[model samples]
Target: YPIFAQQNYENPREATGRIVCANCHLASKPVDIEVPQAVLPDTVFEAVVKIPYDMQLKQVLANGKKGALNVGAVLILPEGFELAPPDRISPEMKEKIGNLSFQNYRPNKKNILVIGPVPGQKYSEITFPILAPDPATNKDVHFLKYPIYVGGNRGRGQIYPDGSKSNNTVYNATAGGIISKILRKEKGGYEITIVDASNERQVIDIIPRGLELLVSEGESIKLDQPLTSNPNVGGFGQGDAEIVLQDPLR
Candidate 1:
């Protein structure tokens, strides 16, 4: 008996000898029947669904190989589709495809929303995601937007009669913490990317501020206004920012 079958239909749990379950079987009278909820077995339906070699896999493979000479890409199809031997690929591609006898490629376990390492130069930028049900905050399922603080300090020490600062003073000066406004995360894994343009500059000759991610959605999350005249880091100077979402928060 399916509860949704009709106005009088009782829930399966409540059905008994008195009720005839028409939804469970084709007839109005109850009969033992095995229900098949899905057309495909869970094993078949739960495939990796590999990207076709002709599509992005082929392209990513080519790009990855181009990074080095002689070294070629060994495509590892995810779980889904099967692959037919590639015909359209060039000889260079075929050569790098790893011998048919050999196979070694890692599979992507899940989709990742990477921040940066952007373009050109080593350590150009840094990025991290703010996801739904963030391991840190578990409130809702909307993208989180909030302001963040980036700061560094020089160690603090006492000035001596010699007109030199002690190591203690230097250590104290470099003690860093969230100054001014500390932001909060909203629901969902809404992301905010902030690049560190001033990584080239140290704030107090002791410690330099690193990249900071400032995400906000209305007044729900924010930092105090006029965020200057202080040594904390916030806002974009000459960097980049973007927001993206990935399904099924991990």
Candidate 2:
């Protein structure tokens, strides 16, 4: 197991036996995760992922020092969902997402979609286009689970105070959960809630990062519609993002 990128050292329960970015870096707070509230069968939608850095740690690096800067991410798709072609990724994140590899962990037999190793300063919002499985073919499934993990190494290349170079020290965070409810308009942007497969509520404010709304309230929106122009902070620049939460009934 590549502990730095795919193995979780925090808790065994947190690991789904899959190789993901959260295995090493600890994202104690929920990172922002976004997706459509619902989608028609076989429909495709965009998904967005964001991870907020520690302000205290961020300030420490401003003095021309780098720490835990090479952040990477992995988007773990539950069974039945399919990742869209590279064309669906936003131009701003295409190069970074394109180079990422698709992984199928042998232990869990879980097939995962991935993206990352992009410089944290160059980009903030990471988007993906995913195709929902046909409803008719899978009648039992209700909501899809899109688990996202983001983390990177801080001390891998850093020089310690004692004149020693650090290596393999990692940091990361997770905002992964089941996609249960879709869009509910909020002051600055939209909110989506996460629940368990039993439809029991799991977490509120799961979509925590801020955004500039691209669609109006009560205005019909498409799966590919741009919901936000920019993410919370430390993002690349003026652009858009996505994360898919599908609804079969609507």
Candidate 1 segments whose C-alpha is farther than 4 A from its true place: 1-121, 129-137, 140-144, 151-250
Report the C-alpha lDDT of model 1 over 167-209, residue by residue, as the tens digit.
Answer: 2211221212223232333421112222222332222212112
User: What C-alpha lDDT values do all the predictions have?
Assistant: 0.21, 0.42
User: Model 2, range 10-56, lDDT digits (tens) per residue?
Assistant: 22224444333333332233445677755666666666666556543
Best by lDDT: 2
Cα displacement (Å) at residue 183, model 1: 52
Q: Mind sharing the TM-score for model 2?
A: 0.43
Could you report the Cα RMSD, in angstroms, for every candidate shown? Answer: 26.6, 21.0
Model 2 segments more than 4 A misplaced: 1-23, 26-30, 54-68, 86-111, 139-250
